[PDB]
Structure 1
Amino acid sequence: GAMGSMERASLIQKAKLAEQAERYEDMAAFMKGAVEKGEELSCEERNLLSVAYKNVVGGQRAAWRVLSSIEQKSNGPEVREYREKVETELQGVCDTVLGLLDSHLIKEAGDAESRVFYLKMKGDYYRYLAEVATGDDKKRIIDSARSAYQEAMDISKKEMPPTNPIRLGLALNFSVFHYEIANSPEEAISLAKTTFDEAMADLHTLSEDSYKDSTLIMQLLRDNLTLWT
């Protein structure tokens, strides 16, 4: 694509500059270009990829919710047309990320840390597609998210300690998937509670810095449990 002529290292450097400038669409385009170089990504580069697209899709999700709410209240074609425009752009971003993951980030990821990271992303972006999906395509999209999250969970439980931040963030997101996408609030609560309690029991093994990383995500699990129970 349009980043084919730029050095991988230059694309990474510009992604970091774009982050500092809060230019997340640019950041995502630079990271897409870095991924398309074909080399595997480091932990820092995976985080740049994820942060960029999370910010882009986050703005789209927030806009879509505003428009959907106005549309529901209003039920001319303009509200529906514009909600559809935003929805299509959101779906396009999800498809782009899912495309990077299947071609070929996931299949080239052999280490637990990288494979879990990417499968969690696959779950997340199918989850964002599910949020806007309506009907049977909705069922298939939900199952795709579930499958990705479940495979990530299986690997993380076998290969990572219970305080691992990637493992914790995965469980957090899968529990939110259960609560409001799969309409399984009890599964959500059970997952969040077990994850929190097993991490709690492992905190004594950690350095001050790792302790801070793990407790930050545990607090998000607690935040959700407080709202759900």
Structure 2
Amino acid sequence: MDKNELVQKAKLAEQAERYDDMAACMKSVTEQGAELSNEERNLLSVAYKNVVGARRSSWRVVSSIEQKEKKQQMAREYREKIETELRDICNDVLSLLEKFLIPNASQAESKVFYLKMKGDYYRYLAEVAAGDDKKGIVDQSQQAYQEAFEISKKEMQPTHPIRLGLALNFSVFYYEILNSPEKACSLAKTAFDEAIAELDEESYKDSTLIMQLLRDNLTLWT
């Protein structure tokens, strides 16, 4: 079960499109105690984004069915099944972040990466929260994005793709979770402009396409 065996079976799992497998591999890597290379870090992030992405999509389908009888009670119970799966996944990632990843990130860029992940999975918890439970989730997401944001401003170029990805997801958080288009647009626009002023290689396609991404959201929000 060596780190690099697991990394290789993880890469195989990705090519096979068996993402629960890939995530279990990368989880094992992470629990081994040591800081994650950029390779590992990215494999982890990809695995869990696909694992959770499937539940997010399924959840959406069944919610929008439930909003359109005993069939309606079927949709409700099934949605709660998917919800419990999704919640269990999210909290798995968040435990990994608090226990291994964030307290081990010596690269400041990784510290931003992990806080942004934390923002993201509290965001996914918030997409499906229902109650007085939801404020605390929303606060955890927003606070984690704000921490990531803050650090990225000191340690990162406005053109850096992790800084811009952090900006995109933060702005989406404001739009979808806080229903606040003004903050969403402000954050997005400030980041696009501080980027388009400093373009002056090899991660270029990343920045620009995230920039394109930022632009697109602006267009649909204004």
TM (norm. structure 1) is 0.94
Residue identity (%): 73
What is the correspondence of 1:187-206 to structure 2 with a 5 Å cutoff? 187-204=183-200
Counterpart in 2 of 1:171? 167
Unaligned stretches of 5+ in structure 1?
1-5
Q: Distance in 1 between matches of 2:35 and 2:181?
A: 37
Q: Distance in 2 between matches of 1:63 and 1:212?
A: 31
2:72 maps to 1:69: no
Counterpart in 1 of 2:14? 19
Q: Is the 8 A contact 2:164 2:211 kept in 1?
A: yes
Q: Amino acid of the residue matched to residue 34 of structure 1?
A: V
Q: Distance in 2 between matches of 1:227 and 1:154?
A: 27
Counterpart in 1 of 2:93? 97
Q: Using the TM superposition, name which of 136-145 and 108-117 deviates more.
A: 108-117
Instruction: Note the alpha carbon deviations across 1:17-76, whole angstroms, 9 max, x for none.
Output: 111111111111110111010110011111100111111111100100111111122695
Aligned with residue 56 of structure 1, among 51, 55, 67: 51
Counterpart in 1 of 2:206? 213
Q: Distance in 2 between matches of 1:160 and 1:118?
A: 15
User: The residue matched to 1:73 in structure 2 has which SS?
Assistant: coil
Aligned-residue offset at 1:108: 1.5
Q: Amino acid of the residue matched to residue 139 of structure 2?
A: D
User: The residue matched to 2:68 in structure 1 has which SS?
Assistant: helix
Q: Distance in 2 between matches of 1:214 and 1:65?
A: 30
Unaligned stretches of 5+ in structure 2?
none
Q: Distance in 1 between matches of 2:113 and 2:60?
A: 27
Q: Distance in 2 between matches of 1:194 and 1:173?
A: 14
User: The residue matched to 1:162 in structure 2 has which SS?
Assistant: coil
Misfit runs of 4+, over 6 Å? none
Change (3 A) 1:13 1:130: same
Aligned-residue offset at 1:135: 2.2
User: The residue matched to 2:157 in structure 1 has which SS?
Assistant: coil
Q: Is the 8 A contact 2:59 2:82 kept in 1?
A: yes
Q: Distance in 2 between matches of 1:75 and 1:198?
A: 54
TM (norm. structure 2) is 0.96
Counterpart in 2 of 1:222? 215
Q: Amino acid of the residue matched to residue 214 of structure 1?
A: S
Q: Distance in 2 between matches of 1:114 and 1:190?
A: 25
Change (3 A) 1:112 1:70: same
User: The residue matched to 2:106 in structure 1 has which SS?
Assistant: coil
2:149 maps to 1:153: yes
